[PDB]
RNA sequence: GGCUGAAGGAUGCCCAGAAGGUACCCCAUUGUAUGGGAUCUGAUCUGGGGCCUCGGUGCACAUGCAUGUGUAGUCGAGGUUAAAAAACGUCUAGGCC
């Protein structure tokens, strides 16, 4: 049983040491890891996903690390005649994280009543600090998940269609968190998405947020980041 | 009681179909929302796909270095079916001790 925990230790060590420049030298270590059980694979994917969405800066490296294990079949423990590819498991974690928003507010609502139940000023302030801290923890996760999906797109483990139905989903929910994520995703995938096969559809995305830019109904910071994204588009994504 | 491995399943690729999505467009309510349609898709499921024909090279054989024959998971060259695939970070049926 110590073998699974030792594999987790080595995977976490590699993730901590992983950096863009020294990438290649650690990849041999990644290919030499004995991942042969659905539990080990799920745990390694859990570690990679958590690190990649909790720390967006180095997510690029982690994305490329995932490319080195795009083909790592393992037999499902329940029915040992079935197999699960690493890609199927890593993408399921990504898609599940992407659509938690539908339920996300719910848990805050489940805590929102407590805001009323904290009678005294000390309790009210402590409850308010905890709820906004939770809101920060969630918005930091969603942004990490979006940048990780965008980084996996540049390595072709995804396709243009998932980005085109992720951008439109973020944009249809005109709430602040979604528009911040839309800014991050377009900023990280604009050059690899601005092609002539997607020229018509893209020509509406920005146009839509242009109205947002002109409406000034949302918070300023959102407009500010949208202006940055539109200006980066105007300069050929560089 | 231990070693090994079938293009038999599974995985990957390709094709068909389905759930789902679909900014823009159109139709209805009509409210910029919902529902339906049209493309475009399809992170997900259900199936199907391991064809021919000809050369080069290599190999083996059989005849007199040459010719004929068969073909190496061979390189190409073309056809055919909607589809001509990772000889596969996998499980088995076995096979051996
Ligand atoms: Mg449909
Ligand atoms: Mg199939
Ligand atoms: Mg089949």
Numbering used by the authors: 754 to 991
Task: Provide excerpts from the study.
The IRES from encephalomyocarditis virus (EMCV) interacts with eukaryotic translation initiation factor 4 G (eIF4G), recruiting the ribosomal subunit for translation. Within the EMCV IRES, the region G680-C787, designated as J-K-St in this study, is responsible for the specific capture of the eIF4GHEAT1. We previously determined the structure of this J-K-St region by solution NMR spectroscopy. It is composed of two stem-loops (J and K domains) bifurcating from a base stem (St domain). At the three-way junction, a highly conserved sequence of six adenosines forms a short stem loop, termed ASL, which interacts with the J, K, and St domains at the junctional part.
Further local refinement with a mask on J-K-St/eIF4GHEAT1 yielded the focused cryo-EM map of the region at a resolution of 3.7 Å. Here, in the cryo-EM structure at 3.7 Å resolution, we clearly showed that J-K-St binds to eIF4GHEAT1 via the J and St domains by adjusting their relative angles to adhere to the surface of eIF4GHEAT1, but not significantly changing the overall structure of eIF4GHEAT1. In the J domain, G702, U703, A704, C705, U722, G723, A724, and U725 interact with eIF4GHEAT1 from the minor groove side. All of these bases, except for A724, interact mainly with the positively charged patch on eIF4GHEAT1 including side chain atoms of Arg 840, Lys841, Lys922, Lys925, and Arg954, whereas the nucleobase of A724 is extruded from the stem to deeply interact with the negatively charged cleft including sidechain atoms of Asp918. In the St domain, G690, A691, U692, G693, C776, G777, U778, and C779 also interact with eIF4GHEAT1 from the minor groove side. All of these residues, except for G777, interact mainly with the positively charged patch on the eIF4GHEAT1 including sidechain atoms of Lys826 and Asn838, whereas the nucleobase of G777 is extruded from the stem to interact with another negatively charged cleft including the mainchain carboxy atoms of Thr784, Leu786, and Ala824, which differs from that contacted by the J domain. Since the cavity on the St domain formed by extrusion of G777 was filled by a lysine residue, Lys826, of eIF4GHEAT1, the flipping-out of G777 is important not only for its direct interaction with eIF4GHEAT1, but also for the formation of the binding pocket for this basic residue. In the J-K-St structure in complex with eIF4GHEAT1/eIF4A, the ASL domain does not form the short stem-loop, and the upper stem of the St domain, which includes the eIF4GHEAT1-binding site, exhibits large base-pairing rearrangements within the ASL domain bases; i.e., G686-A781, A687-U780, G689-C779, G690-U778, A691-C776, U692-A774, and G683-A773. G777 is flipped out to interact with the cleft of eIF4GHEAT1.
